[PDB]
Structure formats: structure tokens, C-alpha cells
């Protein structure tokens, strides 16, 4: 409640490339903690849809071809979400131009890489959450990840959750923290 937490998932590809959001992710997500969920990419699987709705009072699906983008504002930050499959981090000027069309400080896109990535460029913040199911690419395995955006005033703290295999074979959830602060 006192925190404003956005759950960001993308490129689920259920049931065409994956069967389910990994249980070790579901065990971390509980009702009453997430304020809003953005799902990048289509979502046609009834069980996944029902589960996501149980986790937040506000589920927004941003699809392939039913919204084409979504902007959310909290505090002084303006966060844009889109699918943007042709967008790649190796072309930050193309991503920046997209952020400038939406007039957002943070641009989140579910790029065809299916890999978590984030970077800063010209006082803006760019986030690809990867695939929450680890769904393979058409374009080194893909690894499941999702993000939480914790928005406080002019700051966004990004928490990246990733399911990674230890040397002994076990998949465990790792988490990394990145902070963006909008410059004055």
C-alpha cells in the first residue's frame, strides 16, 4: 500500500512456447502487495489470466497487433510500456525517439531478445523485463525473469527477479536492484 509497486511481465507465450509462470515466481507474488500489473504481449491463457488478476487490482495487457501502448504516471515519473519487438538496446536512439513520442521518463519494452536489460540514456531509463516464462526466441538459453518497479517521487527502483540454474541443477530466484532518479 504505502509503496507503489508495478509488476512488469512480458513475452509469456503461454501456451505456445511455455506452459506456466514458474511456481518459484508465483510463490513470491502474493495478493495485496502489487498495485498494478503490466503484461507486455498477448495473454490468451485463462489460468494465467485468472492468476494475474488475483495478484493486483489492475491488470493491463499491452499486445502484439486491446492497447498498443500504455502510459502510467506516479509521483513525477511518466512510464511508457509497449511491445516494441523491433526495438533493441543496440539502437538507443530509436528507443529514445519512442520515449519522446510518448513523453515518458521511463520506457519499458518487451524486445525480441527475451532477455532482461536496462540502461540509462539522455536522462531517461529503458527496461526490458525479459520473458517471465523464459520463452525461447525466434531471433545461451533464455532465462525466466520479471521486474518490479517501485516508484517513489522522482525515483524508480527496479527489482529484477531471475530464475537461474545452480551448478547442481537447482533453479533458484536471484534478485538485482537498479535505481533511476529523474534529473532536476
Amino acid at each position: 500500500s504505502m509503496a507503489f509497486l508495478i509488476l512488469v511481465i512480458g513475452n509469456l507465450h503461454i501456451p505456445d512456447r511455455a506452459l506456466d509462470i514458474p511456481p518459484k515466481f508465483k510463490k513470491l507474488l502474493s495478493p495485496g502487495k502489487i498495485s498494478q500489473t503490466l503484461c507486455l504481449g498477448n495473454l490468451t491463457d485463462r489460468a494465467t489470466y485468472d492468476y494475474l488478476r488475483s495478484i493486483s487490482p489492475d491488470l493491463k495487457i499491452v499486445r502484439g497487433r486491446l492497447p498498443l501502448m500504455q502510459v502510467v504516471t506516479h509521483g513525477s515519473l511518466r512510464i511508457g510500456f509497449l511491445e516494441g519487438f523491433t526495438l533493441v538496446s543496440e539502437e538507443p536512439d530509436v528507443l529514445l525517439a519512442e520515449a519522446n513520442k510518448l513523453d515518458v521518463d521511463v520506457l519499458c519494452w518487451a524486445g525480441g531478445s527475451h532477455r532482461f536489460e536496462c540502461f540509462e540514456y539522455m536522462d531517461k531509463f529503458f527496461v526490458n523485463p525479459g520473458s517471465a516464462t523464459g520463452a525461447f526466441t525466434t531471433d545461451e538459453e533464455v532465462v525466466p525473469s520479471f521486474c518490479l518497479m517501485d516508484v517513489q517521487g522522482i525515483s524508480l527502483t527496479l527489482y529484477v527477479y531471475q530464475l537461474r540454474k545452480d551448478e547442481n541443477g537447482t533453479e533458484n530466484v536471484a534478485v538485482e536492484k537498479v535505481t533511476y532518479t529523474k534529473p532536476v
Partner: peptide, 12 residues
Amino acid sequence: XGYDPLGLKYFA
């Protein structure tokens, strides 16, 4: 010291 929002880990 602190945790991520979901309580998975204190950070180191």
C-alpha cells in the same frame, strides 16, 4: 541490510 519488496533476500 534491507529487503527487496517481496522479502526474498537482504541485499549484502
